[PDB]
């Protein structure tokens with residue numbers, strides 16, 4: 001309802017843990033935003049369920 | 050393709066990072082007899098930073114410069130006292146004193 | 161204000177009106193340093209006034225570390241005499257005070273945020289980089305480093321009266 | 337105006353789906369009908385800007401294009417609104433007008449992008465430390481700061497002060513103490529709102545007690561949130577330390593923060609001596625955190641009593657008996673020359689010259 005009033009989307013940010021190499025050194029991650037998925041109402045992640 | 054050459058390392062998880070903004074340049078400390086030999090080298094050669102840095106393999110040029118500036122700021126009286134007295138340039142006995150300082154610092158590290 | 165600033169550093173340049181050979185003055189002098197691999201000028205240090213000078217082959221020379229204009233003039237004349245003793249027609253021409261840096265203290269703490277809120281167009285306060293506030297007054301064009309300890313450093317002036325008037329003008333701003 | 341009577345009291349009033357100008361005195365119209373664009377043609381027509389209808393936006397070097405794309409990706413990775421992107425690209429295009437700025441290295445352009453997005457976030461009350469920006473830049477922070485000072489001296493734009501409350505709001509949320517993840521025991525979990533309020537009160541106490549002036553804010557914020565976390569449960573958290581808390585929170589602890597912490601603890605002591613029950617309890621540096629809330633209840637009178645007995649660095653609080661010693665007046669210069677033996681002492685002897693030539697032969 002707050003998203004309805006404020007005229008903004010109702011989405012959840014995507015977290016990701018990955019691994020890569022910068023100087024041939026394995027650097028790992030734990031939580032990195034990559035985007036936002038719109039959350040359908042009364043879904044598993046929705047607060048209304 | 051390497052085989053078991055690098056190990057995984059966790060670094061910079063993309064959180065709020067502290068603003069260090071400091072580069073603490075590592076400077077080797079100064080000993081008592083090291084300060085005395087630096088003072089005698091100054092008195093024998095003058096204020097030539099290049100020559101002093103050449104005959105100081107255990108030190109650096111910027112370290113010698115910082116030490117000279119600190120001495121001129123704090124113990125200018127001793128600086129002038131050393132500059133008034135003169136001593137001829139010695140090479141063989143200077144190398145012998147360098148070896149003695151090497152042995153002394155080795156004994157100090159053994160302690 | 162009841163407080164008089166203390167001048168600490170004087171910068172002044174002088175032209176010798178003749179060409180010099182840096183290797184000659186660096187080879188026959190004990191207090192001279194010349195390393196052309198990094199810096200192509202001669203560094204000399206005179207002890208009695210405790211000042212340091214830079215000598216260039218083009219004939220220009222600059223002094224630093226003096227406390228007053230008279231001490232800077234004395235150091236410049238000493239360096240001119242030294243250059244003349246090495247077989248060079250050095251002259252003392254076009255002598256003018258270029259810069260002066262002084263320090264002082266107010267003996268009370270100073271809020272570095274109220275100043276940047278009231279004098280934003282005259283200062284650039286960034287505590288994340290340097291603790292001291294940097295104030296730039298445009299009427300005398302003076303740069304001031306201010307600290308929470310109350311001690312203030314002033315620079316950019318040409319005469320002692322400029323430092324004095326800058327301090328007496330910045331004092332009510334710091335007190336308020 | 338009125339063509340007949342000359343009255344200039346013409347009023348715009350909405351008729352029955354008709355716009356016109358009429359005078360209120362004689363009721364005569366001077367201009368009726370208005371021409372407006374239709375949405376059927378509005379969606380067909382393409383908008384043209386004066387940045388493109390003048391020949392500009394084509395004299396954009398490959399380096400300027402790289403710089404603006406860097407600004408775009410930097411403001412996008414921070415998840416900033418498009419208004420921030422517009423303001424940042426405007427600031428970049430304004431700063432790129434100088435000849436000394438356009439002729440520079442890639443490091444210079446990158447640190448300029450960093451400083452531009454920093455100013456952009458500083459404008460609309462968006463706190464963001466320079467460390468988090470330098471982390472996303474392929475350069476060092478010293479040259480970044482030097483270029484920042486240079487460009488703020490050259491342009492002289494508005495630079496708001498970093499707000500401490502918003503910085504605390506941004507910094508406290510980065511901790512993982514709010515969620516009961518398997519990596520942290522359930523005893524360390526706390527509520528986000530209570531911890532945020534406690535940290536805000538503690539950083540306000542630090543601000544009013546001269547602990548935000550000069551020193552970096554982040555160590556003070558870390559000390560404040562550490563004291564808050566300890567006071568929330570001293571039964572099971574007083575035995576820990578700042579290093580243990582930073583290791584558990586997976587956050588790089590500031591080096592001076594502990595020292596800052598000590599100073600704050602000292603302040604707490606200077607408050608605990610004023611309260612009767614606390615001054616009878618005879619607390620110490622360790623047992624003072626458990627009453628921090630009480631110290632935050634009546635902090636105003638406590639800090640007033642503490643200041644009626646200021647804060648300065650410990651280097652100058654050693655009772656300086658000689659403050660700014662006056663140097664002796666020695667502005668004399670003799671007549672023309674005080675002495676000439678100084679030149680004889682400063683010159684090199686032929687033996688010394690030969691030794692110098694042999695040393696580095």
Ligand SMILES: [Zn+2]
Pocket residue numbers: 338339340341342343359361362363364
């Ligand atoms: Zn009419």
